[PDB]
Design a binder for this molecule. Structure first.
Ligand SMILES: O=P(O)(O)OC[C@@H](O)CO
Length: 295
């Protein structure tokens, strides 16, 4: 029963907003605005995407601008409002971005053999006194933001279903804003427990943002699709095809993109469909009562 906002049409039944055929509704911007997902300080990813965005500019013939958005809500609103044209949305926000911002997802990173994904992990710091999930009872649990799968919705569902633990009764929730804030907060002993994306954790460890001896894992979830990449529904069809081509034609070898994302096992972009690959996420959304009320 997934529903797009009534400002979009879904004539072909693939659950994503159709490209308009009224030419007055299409946009052909002279500057394409791109945003990666704020799982971490976007300053970390500015140079990571730089060469990729140069290739995108050459492929599309447009100027390209990196938008260092700081929260999921701001990123969703920017695409809904027409200011953001191409984005990677965090896994947990793809259904909301599809429904309320007209996001058309088409690709996801994968390993060289086509395997993909990340898991939620619940982490503490060594010596915290929190040595398994059950030890969280009566204490605080750090979440990232309410649109996060691994940072809020998946751990809330797992704790309620498998550990008989609900926020406000069995633990007190706190919100850090970002995976990196949660991971840093655990490493610095601000948080005794946090639910985080282990892909982000591994790249932060590789970049020496935190050290291995500062973090202990207490739980690892099932595997989820990673960040979904896509386009605002109302760019001209010709431009959308060129953007997709730019994603698949970019040569990763020797680039800052490969240097970063090889640290969570990625090597390429592969096609996905929202209907298939995000089914597990829509179910976790429904288990948390998510409505997709765009307001
Ligand atoms: O914050 P979540 O929703 O778990 O998304 C992280 C995911 O985008 C990592 O690839």
């Amino acid at each position: 029963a997934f529903q797009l906002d009534s400002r979009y049409q879904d004539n072909d039944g693939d659950l994503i907003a159709d490209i308009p055929s009224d030419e007055s509704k299409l946009v052909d911007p002279s500057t394409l605005v791109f945003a990666y997902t704020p799982v971490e300080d976007p300053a970390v990813y500015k140079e990571v995407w730089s060469e990729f965005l140069d290739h995108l500019a050459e492929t599309t013939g447009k100027n390209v601008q990196f938008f260092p958005v700081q929260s999921n809500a701001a990123q969703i609103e920017a695409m809904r409002a027409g200011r953001l044209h191409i984005a990677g949305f965090n896994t947990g926000s793809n259904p909301l971005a599809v429904a309320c911002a007209g996001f058309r997802p088409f690709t996801m990173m994968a390993a060289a053999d086509g395997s993909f994904g990340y898991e939620m992990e619940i982490i503490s710091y060594p010596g915290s006194g929190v040595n398994d999930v059950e030890d969280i009872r009566g204490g605080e649990l750090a979440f990232t933001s309410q649109t996060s799968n691994s940072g809020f919705k998946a751990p809330s569902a797992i704790l309620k279903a498998d550990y008989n633990m609900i926020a406000g009764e069995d633990f007190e929730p706190v919100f850090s804003g970002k995976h990196d804030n949660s991971i840093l907060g655990v490493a610095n002993r601000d948080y005794k427990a946090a639910a985080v994306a282990n892909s982000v954790l591994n790249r932060m460890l590789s970049r020496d943002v935190v050290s291995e001896d500062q973090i202990v894992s207490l739980y690892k979830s099932q595997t989820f699709p990673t960040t979904g990449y896509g386009i605002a529904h109302n760019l001209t069809p010709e431009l959308q095809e060129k953007i997709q081509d730019a994603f698949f034609s970019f040569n990763w070898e020797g680039t800052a993109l490969e240097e970063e994302f090889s640290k969570s096992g990625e090597a390429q972009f592969v096609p996905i469909t929202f209907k298939n690959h995000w089914e597990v996420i829509r179910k976790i959304d429904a288990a948390n009562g998510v409505a997709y009320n765009c307001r």
